[PDB]
Enzyme design. Structure first.
Site, PDB file in Angstrom:
ATOM      1  N   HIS A 135      34.223  54.241  42.284  1.00 41.64           N
ATOM      2  CA  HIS A 135      34.351  55.151  43.424  1.00 41.64           C
ATOM      3  C   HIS A 135      33.419  54.604  44.499  1.00 41.64           C
ATOM      4  O   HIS A 135      32.250  54.983  44.584  1.00 41.64           O
ATOM      5  CB  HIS A 135      33.994  56.589  43.022  1.00 41.64           C
ATOM      6  CG  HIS A 135      34.426  57.627  44.016  1.00 41.64           C
ATOM      7  ND1 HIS A 135      34.025  58.944  43.937  1.00 41.64           N
ATOM      8  CD2 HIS A 135      35.210  57.541  45.118  1.00 41.64           C
ATOM      9  CE1 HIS A 135      34.547  59.626  44.943  1.00 41.64           C
ATOM     10  NE2 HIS A 135      35.275  58.799  45.671  1.00 41.64           N
ATOM     11  N   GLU A 143      45.151  61.189  37.871  1.00 40.93           N
ATOM     12  CA  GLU A 143      45.947  61.776  36.802  1.00 40.93           C
ATOM     13  C   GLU A 143      47.207  62.394  37.374  1.00 40.93           C
ATOM     14  O   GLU A 143      48.303  62.209  36.849  1.00 40.93           O
ATOM     15  CB  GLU A 143      45.151  62.848  36.067  1.00 40.93           C
ATOM     16  CG  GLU A 143      43.999  62.300  35.254  1.00 40.93           C
ATOM     17  CD  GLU A 143      43.577  63.257  34.162  1.00 40.93           C
ATOM     18  OE1 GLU A 143      42.367  63.536  34.054  1.00 40.93           O
ATOM     19  OE2 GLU A 143      44.460  63.739  33.421  1.00 40.93           O
ATOM     20  N   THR A 161      34.087  62.749  42.912  1.00 40.04           N
ATOM     21  CA  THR A 161      34.599  61.799  41.925  1.00 40.04           C
ATOM     22  C   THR A 161      35.491  62.498  40.902  1.00 40.04           C
ATOM     23  O   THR A 161      36.542  61.973  40.533  1.00 40.04           O
ATOM     24  CB  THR A 161      33.459  61.051  41.189  1.00 40.04           C
ATOM     25  OG1 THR A 161      32.714  60.260  42.124  1.00 40.04           O
ATOM     26  CG2 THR A 161      34.035  60.126  40.105  1.00 40.04           C
TER      27      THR A 161
END
Lengths: 135, 133
Positions: free
Chosen positions: A75, A49, A41
């Protein structure tokens, strides 16, 4: 230097290697020793990002960069090494030095998560000056 | 395991937990600030939740992170101690949600929520292998 257009979709493709599992995030962690061999994760957060950073790069002025200031994602499926994770990042707004994104990811088999991410444009060197006051 | 119970661990940030170390594969990260990465902060938060749940898991069981919603509002250079606290906020089915927060001894650097799902390792690993090329 021309600004970014809201609602524009950008894609970042990444073939997951073996060294982006849970245990590779924190090799220091005995308590992660049994973790399944799947894309972590924390690494997925970094990939999202990364996708946003690539998109804004041509739009930033000399000396400028950005930092991630918030992330809010699911997730919902796990990805073994070998699959390609595609991140889609779409700009929601820019208000000053704040950019807001929606992000989602798919490993070619399942959608593996989605949500939002916010970033702050900074001047790299003058930011380090602020940080160093903490080091 | 009980709602409201808390676990805290501390972690001195090393040089190799900076942004550019999360992905050495990234040229676009090469000039990133030398500060503790969000991805690593998230990982340290998961780690706190994982440790706190461990004594309550049956043998052969484990967990995965299924949701993370956090702010990261101050940056931490190497050498500062990041303290992370995880508080159980709710449980339903095989899912536990935690409130997580972190401070570096100077500023509160972020906080939010994290969800995990308890899994039977063997069963899950088998599934993963069937998704593998």
């Amino acid at each position: 230097k021309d600004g970014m257009r809201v609602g524009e979709r950008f894609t970042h493709d990444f073939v997951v290697p073996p060294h982006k599992t849970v245990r590779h995030l924190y090799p220091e962690s005995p308590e992660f020793a049994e973790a399944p061999e799947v894309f972590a994760t924390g690494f997925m957060v970094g990939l999202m990002e990364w996708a946003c950073v690539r998109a804004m790069a041509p739009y930033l002025e000399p000396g400028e960069g950005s930092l991630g200031t918030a992330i809010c994602v699911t997730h919902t499926a796990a990805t073994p090494p070998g699959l390609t994770v595609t991140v889609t990042a779409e700009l929601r707004s820019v208000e000053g030095r704040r950019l807001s994104w929606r992000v989602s990811a798919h490993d070619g088999v399942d959608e593996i998560g989605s949500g939002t991410h916010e970033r702050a444009v900074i001047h790299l060197e003058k930011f380090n000056a602020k940080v160093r006051q903490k080091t």
